[PDB]
Design an enzyme around this catalytic site. Structure first.
Site, short mmCIF file in Angstrom:
data_model
loop_
_atom_site.label_atom_id
_atom_site.label_comp_id
_atom_site.label_asym_id
_atom_site.label_seq_id
_atom_site.Cartn_x
_atom_site.Cartn_y
_atom_site.Cartn_z
N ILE A 5 1.01 -1.14 0.12
CA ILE A 5 -0.13 0.10 0.20
C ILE A 5 0.72 1.32 0.04
CG2 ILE A 5 -1.79 -1.16 1.40
CD1 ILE A 5 -0.78 0.31 3.88
N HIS B 257 -4.64 -4.20 -2.00
CA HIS B 257 -4.90 -3.93 -0.86
C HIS B 257 -5.16 -2.20 -0.80
CE1 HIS B 257 -2.98 -7.48 1.30
NE2 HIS B 257 -4.16 -7.60 0.88
N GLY C 193 9.70 -10.67 -3.58
CA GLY C 193 9.40 -9.91 -2.48
C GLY C 193 8.10 -10.47 -1.77
N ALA D 252 13.65 -13.37 -0.74
CA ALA D 252 14.91 -13.73 0.36
C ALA D 252 14.79 -15.12 0.87
CB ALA D 252 14.70 -12.51 1.47
N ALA E 231 15.65 -8.28 -3.26
CA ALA E 231 15.06 -7.71 -4.39
C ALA E 231 15.82 -6.34 -5.06
CB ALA E 231 13.58 -7.20 -4.45
#
Ligand SMILES: NC(=O)c1ccc[n+]([C@@H]2O[C@H](COP(=O)([O-])OP(=O)(O)OC[C@H]3O[C@@H](n4cnc5c(N)ncnc54)[C@H](O)[C@@H]3O)[C@@H](O)[C@H]2O)c1
Ligand SMILES: NC(=O)c1ccc[n+]([C@@H]2O[C@H](COP(=O)([O-])OP(=O)(O)OC[C@H]3O[C@@H](n4cnc5c(N)ncnc54)[C@H](O)[C@@H]3O)[C@@H](O)[C@H]2O)c1
Ligand SMILES: NC(=O)c1ccc[n+]([C@@H]2O[C@H](COP(=O)([O-])OP(=O)(O)OC[C@H]3O[C@@H](n4cnc5c(N)ncnc54)[C@H](O)[C@@H]3O)[C@@H](O)[C@H]2O)c1
Ligand SMILES: Nc1ncnc2c1ncn2[C@@H]1O[C@H](COP(=O)(O)OP(=O)(O)OC[C@H]2O[C@H](O)[C@H](O)[C@@H]2O)[C@@H](O)[C@H]1O
Ligand SMILES: [Zn+2]
Ligand SMILES: [Zn+2]
Ligand SMILES: [Zn+2]
Ligand SMILES: [Zn+2]
Ligand SMILES: [Zn+2]
Ligand SMILES: [Zn+2]
Ligand SMILES: [Zn+2]
Ligand SMILES: [Zn+2]
Ligand SMILES: [Zn+2]
Lengths: 252, 252, 252, 248, 240
Positions: A102, A118, A191, A218, A235
């Site tokens: 967001i 979202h 991510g 990750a 990333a």
């Protein structure tokens, strides 16, 4: 290794409608901690408690303190991963970004089509009198450590237009996300642990449709084996190397 | 004269957070005919092929030609009913308009808060390249029998943002409409038969929450018994009468 | 003999893997009021407040008062509709019941395969010490005017194994229901407005798979158009008439 | 006796913008019992349990049953009327009251600031639903304590200021403005021990307004007043009015 | 902000304000078209299709609606400050925005008449055909002489409407011009009439006018952006 980056770059180079799905992971290198591992530990409040429509009402101040908390910064900026994706969009490869973030870091990095499952804090609404506002309207308030307050009725229930725990997702957006997975030729996850619906389902949708898949994260996810290329790393360091390698394939 | 109109005005003049729910009947006086049967309509066309998302993705022309044949008024303008409702908002009485119509006549008439449960003919999206257009760019071509085509990629998959069969109602809007019915102090229905969800349920939600109930319709409905005031008549005629009366109560 | 009933029977008579989807409407005649219309208005409290996970924790007494509320009867038992469906299974026609009801009335009527999308009251769990219980074990307690209480640790957090508002929908049971719709040859909705996810999706999934569609409901629904047979009426009165007809058709 | 009241009529008569601050004592004449002093309730009941927020959250039945014991359908007395006539006459511009009996309104007063709120409205502390007293008025008289009809909670709190609670912001604001913009401030039937309401007399005193206090007994804040009348409000106030009609 | 505050101060203190609006609120024509043929009454009787073709080609935007300046002015009247709106505009935007007393000096497109059988019509009865590119035609007699009640070259200005507007200027306490160059009569004179009568003068325009000197408050900007701001400041001065 670098070999995985090679294969990722080779898949993208020959794609013209690639899609990128991103989670909190892609913004960790911008100072916005995720809700997982040490980051989840770092944050004081529990997101399900203070970031629900109930928590917001019972204690709007805590909601803002939790939502705005960052690592050594007040506002976030896009990191090289965000720019790398926007670049791929300029190169005629990436045609859409589906994100659960967001933070609007994709747009600010130059991405033209971003599906926000979202929502975002670009706009806010007073829950009492319904006055709508642009984020920029409370810049001074935030600057002095205060929370948004409706100028029309005085209410402290100025809710940002994001999906809080206990609310549905934007359907026009959810539908576009699925349709996007259904017709992309390449689907790259960046991510994301692929846990929050529909993160666990979009990959399978795109694979059924025949898309080539890449995942940059990750840590490993349960769906890793179904992807064509799996890359473990940050990333912000991996994506730019993938872009460069794509440019080298088009150059040399 | 007319005890119902006076009573409706009394309730409104006393409310500070009233909501108005409208159906196809409020736009009947603008030149847009209501369903009228609706069952026979599905005797002429296969609903699945001309009005479902699945039918649209299979053959766009079916939906558009279906729409051209039952076209009706494309340049309709709001009528007295729409204006009366906007006037009530300006007076600080009406705080929200919930509608099932897709004509956007409420906004064009001045309403600042309109929750469109079935979407609206405001914008369209090319399903192939994602370009978005305003309905104003296709209206005239469509009125000449020309199926809208994407100008950037040439696709015939330009889908309007209205709810089709097979797809869910806009959740965040529906969610807002329901919250609206739960905290309003006055709930008025204008031109809706209240036969199918959500139209059929919102009145009961507001009723349980304690709001005063008013309905203005050309014909009775099965929900009629729960309304404090029920008026038989045309919205475009009745609504301005109620407003005038409200103004008079305000000026005394 | 209504013609739509006869048509529904002809469809079932030729099916060997019919699936029945039921909502709150099929148990209303057993005395369990729905959450809609007059029933919802008649019911004590607002469902989302008392029947949510947080409502249960803060006021278990209100939750049980709400859950056990009966209308027009004092205790619930299967009605003619439940038995009709159980009979259709005995006749080798119906192979599965997908329900959102938690009353266990289908199993009590004799149905063997019942997919419970929202779980059921059949089992309960103390959320504190995890002792598990059968519904039968609290019958006497309710008769004495008390609410379930863990006999092992004294907690009043004895949560029936159902899906409360604020809790996610069971994912595995959901996938099994989708698969059920994808391979049935007849899909019949009984007592559902097809509003609560995935009630509105399942019928479309079955239609795409080639199933013949039937809907029996007290009021029309938004998806009514896609069904081959539509019947307006009370489940308890319609279902047995359908079964009698099916037995006649098989008589020769 | 006259000297004090005579002086009081002189001030009010010359007063252009007077404010009246009332306590439970002005409603003694209406059969309603006071809280402190003689026959006070805070001697036959524990405020920390029946009139405090911590006590309400602890056991809501205490507050509601205590409230049922005081079920008494009261009417204005000559004191409330004397205040309303003093308002029609243009002298009194507003009444600030700590009472919830609403006897000032029924008496005909138009400017009434309910510093300590009223039972008019209620809020469920659990689901935040709001109600009008009318919604529970029938179950209350039948001995049933109010229960939220939305969530079933037994924490339906009337909008009255209990101990440990802040005063309604908008009302406190209006009251302070009045205490500042006044040349005559009269206190009636108030022990002047509960703050911040007791601060208004000082806010008006420091602003230069004449101070008059009519109470059935001396308060530990008498000094701030230019003249105190020790007696019953139902008898003293009416005499203050006529004496103002003699001069005026 | 400065001039805007002063304008608000004047409006907040006035009880009979009048607003005059021109085309500049809705922010070589005669070189492309012959006014004598497409916009005069003689041209219309000669060939009604010329006027209607001219109108169709210059329709502007679809689903047009009032802008924030129209709503702000309607609001001012609702607040009991503005008592009349004088306009040279013919698109009924003030009425749609909520204004109740509007003096249309050039008439409007809302009413039309068949010049042959005299049947009257509302614009809503032709708006559909118009936008489809079809000329309005009388449905009672079939004539193609359906003329809207707008002022065409060769026709007189509405006399009664003009005099009512002159009276408004003579007895108002405030006169505010919005979106007008004030070059042609009566627009060019009304401000001077109000000025002589002793009213406070305000002008909101994108560009300066030769009449600017007589104005007490001069604001330069877009009406759609200035008016809502003036209205806000007026509400703020009434809360205190
Ligand atoms: N807008 C935001 O920046 C923001 C921040 C926190 C949470 N949220 C949202 O809330 C939900 C839950 O969040 P969550 O954090 O539990 O789930 P998530 O799956 O979105 O979490 C992030 C994942 O990122 C990986 N990760 C961490 N740093 C990384 C880096 N530098 N490079 C690549 N990968 C990295 C982790 O291994 C972890 O699985 C998600 O939908 C998420 O998008 C949004
Ligand atoms: N399957 C069914 O039996 C059924 C029945 C009705 C509606 N529907 C569905 O519901 C939706 C529409 O519902 P809706 O309520 O908006 O429309 P509607 O067509 O059901 O009802 C409009 C109502 O307005 C009234 N009306 C007509 N002219 C009027 C005027 N001038 N002023 C005031 N009232 C006037 C009518 O008497 C009618 O009850 C559609 O999507 C449709 O397919 C289904
Ligand atoms: N286990 C239970 O008995 C029970 C009771 C209430 C609600 N719930 C569940 O909660 C959710 C929401 O409930 P809801 O009531 O809002 O939705 P629903 O769609 O399940 O509601 C019932 C529907 O029943 C129809 N109906 C009423 N009486 C009927 C009868 N005799 N015959 C045929 N149809 C009849 C109504 O027209 C309405 O569309 C659903 O998932 C539902 O199953 C379960
Ligand atoms: N007829 C009468 N006329 C004038 N005064 C009288 C009369 N009868 C009694 N009194 C005096 O009225 C005063 C009332 O004081 P309190 O009982 O303390 O009431 P009040 O000043 O209204 O403060 C009470 C506040 O505390 C409670 O917690 C509650 O919230 C209330 O608003 C006492 O000093 C008492 O002697
Ligand atoms: Zn507000
Ligand atoms: Zn795409
Ligand atoms: Zn396209
Ligand atoms: Zn609202
Ligand atoms: Zn236990
Ligand atoms: Zn099966
Ligand atoms: Zn409650
Ligand atoms: Zn004619
Ligand atoms: Zn005038």
């Amino acid at each position: 290794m670098e070999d995985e980056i090679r294969k990722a770059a080779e898949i993208l180079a020959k794609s013209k409608h690639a899609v990128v799905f991103t989670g909190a992971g892609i913004s960790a290198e911008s100072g916005i901690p995720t809700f997982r591992g040490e980051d989840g530990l770092w944050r004081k409040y529990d997101p399900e408690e203070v970031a629900s429509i109930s928590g917001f009402k019972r204690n709007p101040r805590a909601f803002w303190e939790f939502s705005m908390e960052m690592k050594d910064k007040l506002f976030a900026e896009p990191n090289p991963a965000h720019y790398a994706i926007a670049e791929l969009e300029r190169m005629g490869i990436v045609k859409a970004v589906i994100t659960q973030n967001i933070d609007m870091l994709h747009q600010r990095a130059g991405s033209r089509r971003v599906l926000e499952l979202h929502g975002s804090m670009d706009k806010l609404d007073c829950l009492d009198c319904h006055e709508t506002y642009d984020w920029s309207e409370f810049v001074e308030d935030f600057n002095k450590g205060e929370i948004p307050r409706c100028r029309k009725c005085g209410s402290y229930y100025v809710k940002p237009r994001v999906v809080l725990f206990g609310e549905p997702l934007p359907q026009r957006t959810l539908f576009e996300a699925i349709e996007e997975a259904k017709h992309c030729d390449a689907f790259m996850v960046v991510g994301s642990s692929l846990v929050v619906y529909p993160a666990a389902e979009l990959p399978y949708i795109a694979k059924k449709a025949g898309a080539k898949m890449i995942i940059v994260n990750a840590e490993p996810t349960m769906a890793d084996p179904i992807f064509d290329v799996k890359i473990i790393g940050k990333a912000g360091e991996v994506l730019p190397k993938i872009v460069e390698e794509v440019k080298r394939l088009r150059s040399e």
